[PDB]
Symmetry: D2
Subunit: 302 residues, 4 copies
Amino acid sequence: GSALPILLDCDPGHDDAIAIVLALASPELDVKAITSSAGNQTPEKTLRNVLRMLTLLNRTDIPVAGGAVKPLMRELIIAESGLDGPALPEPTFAPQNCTAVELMAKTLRESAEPVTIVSTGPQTNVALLLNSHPELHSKIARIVIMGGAMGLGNWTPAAEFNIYVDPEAAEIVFQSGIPVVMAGLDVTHKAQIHVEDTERFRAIGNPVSTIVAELLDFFLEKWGFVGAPLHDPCTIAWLLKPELFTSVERWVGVETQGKYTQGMTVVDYYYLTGNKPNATVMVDVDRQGFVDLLADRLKFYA
Amino acid sequence: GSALPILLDCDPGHDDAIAIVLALASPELDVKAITSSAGNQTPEKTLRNVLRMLTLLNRTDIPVAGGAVKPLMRELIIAESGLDGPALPEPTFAPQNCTAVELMAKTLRESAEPVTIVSTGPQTNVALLLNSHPELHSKIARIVIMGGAMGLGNWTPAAEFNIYVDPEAAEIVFQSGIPVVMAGLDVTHKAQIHVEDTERFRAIGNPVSTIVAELLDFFLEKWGFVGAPLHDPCTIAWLLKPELFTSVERWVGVETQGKYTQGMTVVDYYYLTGNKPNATVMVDVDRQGFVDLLADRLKFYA
Amino acid sequence: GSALPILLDCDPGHDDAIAIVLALASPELDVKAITSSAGNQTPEKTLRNVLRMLTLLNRTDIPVAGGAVKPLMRELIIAESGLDGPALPEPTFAPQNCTAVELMAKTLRESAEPVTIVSTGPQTNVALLLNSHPELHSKIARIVIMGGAMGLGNWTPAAEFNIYVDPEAAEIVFQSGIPVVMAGLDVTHKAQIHVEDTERFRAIGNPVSTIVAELLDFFLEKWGFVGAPLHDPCTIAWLLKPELFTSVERWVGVETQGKYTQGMTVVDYYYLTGNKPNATVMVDVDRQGFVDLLADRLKFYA
Amino acid sequence: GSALPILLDCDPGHDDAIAIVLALASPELDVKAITSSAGNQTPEKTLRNVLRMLTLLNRTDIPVAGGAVKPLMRELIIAESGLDGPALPEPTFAPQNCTAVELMAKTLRESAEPVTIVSTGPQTNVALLLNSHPELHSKIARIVIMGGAMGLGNWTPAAEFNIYVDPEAAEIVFQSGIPVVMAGLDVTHKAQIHVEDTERFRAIGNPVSTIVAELLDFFLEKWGFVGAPLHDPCTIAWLLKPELFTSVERWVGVETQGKYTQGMTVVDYYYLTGNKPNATVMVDVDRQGFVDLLADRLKFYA
Ligand SMILES: OC[C@H]1O[C@@H](O)[C@H](O)[C@@H]1O
Ligand SMILES: OC[C@H]1O[C@@H](O)[C@H](O)[C@@H]1O
Ligand SMILES: OC[C@H]1O[C@@H](O)[C@H](O)[C@@H]1O
Ligand SMILES: OC[C@H]1O[C@@H](O)[C@H](O)[C@@H]1O
Ligand SMILES: [Ca+2]
Ligand SMILES: [Ca+2]
Ligand SMILES: [Ca+2]
Ligand SMILES: [Ca+2]
């Protein structure tokens, strides 16, 4: 029958690109559209990068649209192409002549079943969709994000990059009443790709496994990591094999006003507030299992 | 030739309704659509009220769409129909099968010239349009709002109602780079309709002038007002006869974080900041001239 | 209140252009869109001509779309710009990024009341609308055409030009079950503009009355006419002042198969068939009254 | 990579339904939409039948739209549900809120590559698409029809049913300049399913192979057939395995005017006219190979 319908919103970005690769190697998922957010790079670059990845993967049938050019209430800060390392093809196809929100809305309207949204850059497009289309909330099964940290941030002391870029958009997502699943730094810093794992991917032997290895190569070349955290593919991996993860439901609030804490995801892990949980927070992963999943799925491109 | 194209976004609301009446009596203006915001009443009620007013005025040709159901990042607070007083007709037509933002976007796309947006409730729809359609900013001539106060607020000590309902949306408007014109309480509290003026409107003698009088009657039945301030029609009046007003260009910022000041419009009247002006702020009005304008235009419905 | 909503489909064409002028000088009518058919000239030229006329008339607010590039089942035959004579402005605006049928459909969907279609070239676009949008038939009040002849044709012995170009499309219109009103050659050959009438239009003295005179000049420079028949404006004139015309309801069939009669409108004037009437056929006009109407309306452009 | 994109337009109809089954069991094909034509049954029934088949097959992700309610220029004639025999599920999903032509156009616009149209009922929707969207012809790779007969007809002496229902639409398709491939009665009368073949399908053992057998059962219960011709699946079979067929390129004209020959496909097999070929005409099939293909593909539903 039909697969699980998903909308992927992202800002490639090496790990976003690997998330695309993993999703497209997974027949359990039906990627309905890919839209670009601005974060890792400027909106022109993230859009171009989605197109190049879909060109590489011979999935020009998936509609693409460029999203918001900046955060809701803040100027854009960025992380020279945004996908440096491998030689990638020029796009062989054009994005749709609409915005990301328009393409997401069209998908939700057209759909006969609730759609899962996966957003692995700043939450700007997702927030705009939620606020502008209250009539389509019933068509959203859940929103699976890469962003936030119960613990320390990777951009400012308290904040992870994606949330920091657009804290207001993230807060809108968490306040929306739609189930939210969060792959924060607590899980992604455990999802490390060691040099031996990149070697393993390279040894798979096909052009896509090679490109994935090259993407991983370039990024790697105080945190105390053995290998590089591979953040965005944790969202897709969780959809495919949730048994690889430990996840808890807690209340999460995004700080938008603090002097020293803008963009922090405040997670009420110990039930200190009266707040009902609004998110599933990933807190652990079987790292070898995660690597095994990526390696197995890369055989799709043989 | 063609008139000045406008998009009217509002939350009727007695003064919003009078603003509709004034706009539709003015051949210099071409009202392209009317959309409803939530503020004065719930979104179902403000939508119904737009429809009832257009039914009354025999302008069922103007497309109508309901907007956002709540503020961007806040729960809705409201000011039992929202237009109490006169007996109004049930709607004879349906709203468009799209959202307010969709209808605004379609208008801007279709337009051969920049369109003036007039927004007299909370700025929620306008902000969603600005953020979701960066490609359409060049199609927006200016945004004329009723909201804010250089001086004291009418809802909280520092904040006027429309801005207070959605401070984030108002801030997005003021930060947008599109010319903004503000009819705040500084001007609207001067735009008082005295009992003698309502008598004058009633003496015009047609069904619409009568309804306007009834709307004014009901609202009237510490501020030190002689008559009731008629806020929202100041936006339309400024478009028709700017010579009735004194306006200055200053920097305006909307407070979104303060303990005691959320929703305040902070106006740098005395050039104390380094900030370049982003708004035209109305600070005075020829009150009798404003009343004369309304009375003259009401003859349209003879 | 609101005016009579119309969709104008045409192939300018000097008389089509004069029909546009007359319609836009008439506040009783609300021209919702103008679309171009191919007939008098190629589809690129008729589209350009609509745009030039709307530019001249300062009505760039009326949306324009190009229609079908050829007849349904036949190659295009045409009557070097298609509006030769006057110097006309280059367009200052673009057509909509949709087809004529799409623009007509959007209009009908958006409308709160049945819309009158006026089609003064071949019926190609109208037929495509009727067949492709059966759900919108209830939104069409009537279809007013310029085309056909109860008597002799002006293109082949039995056929008038517009019907001859696309007989199948015309037959679809007449078979549609929507009220059809026909300004055929029986009426239009009586609607002659004499040299003295063109002088009168020229003496009105404004740039548009001058252009109309120039259009009439050029066309004029066996039929036994005193002046040139002004065909297409008879449709608009009938909407404005039906009392200027004598019209009868009869059955009309369009010949699509005959050896010698393709494109003939067969009118059962004497009730010789069992067929129920499907059209209002204009058979007479008060010519001076028609000229008076045009001259009076041209004062609009003073 | 991505599969071959197709638009399926059909009027189920037992063989149309089997064509849907075959297409959805074939990963080489990406069915972008299914639209309904009127022919075998009324338009309400063919639409319902598409929905029931997609419900059965768990492919509610494929968008569906109802098409034209009657032939272009003729009243509808039909072949009590239109899919009698098996118990089928009620639809679990709704058709799109647009017409067939609108859905086809949207698909063609959105597509990054030319799309193959397969039409197995009357050509009404396809013709409307071709005439109304000349700008999208370059997005149509080819049109594969079931219809016509080089030899004798199955509805009137000279005409096959699908062409007879709408000869004008078929003629528009053949005149369009887009490559046309025709599975006429010459091939479909050879594509017979014997009782032993239905037994074989039934022995495959899954719910879908069972339903296919039931559909074949009911239809069977002067022509000189051993088994029932299975017409519409020949189009899909030709796309999957053209080596099963013998096909020739010849000129084909559809008769629309004849006294005794309306709806005939006139095939210039012996090059007697000066006309350049406009169609690929299927003239032979490896019947056992065709049955083998259906049986192999039915294993998809195990
Ligand atoms: O902080 C993690 C995020 O930063 C970006 O660099 C990655 O794409 C990821 O989504
Ligand atoms: O505070 C003024 C605003 O409050 C509302 O009651 C009016 O409609 C006006 O827009
Ligand atoms: O035959 C009359 C028609 O021919 C065209 O030349 C005119 O525009 C008119 O519509
Ligand atoms: O004549 C063959 C056609 O008739 C219909 O009954 C079938 O579905 C097929 O498409
Ligand atoms: Ca990312
Ligand atoms: Ca208001
Ligand atoms: Ca004409
Ligand atoms: Ca069929």
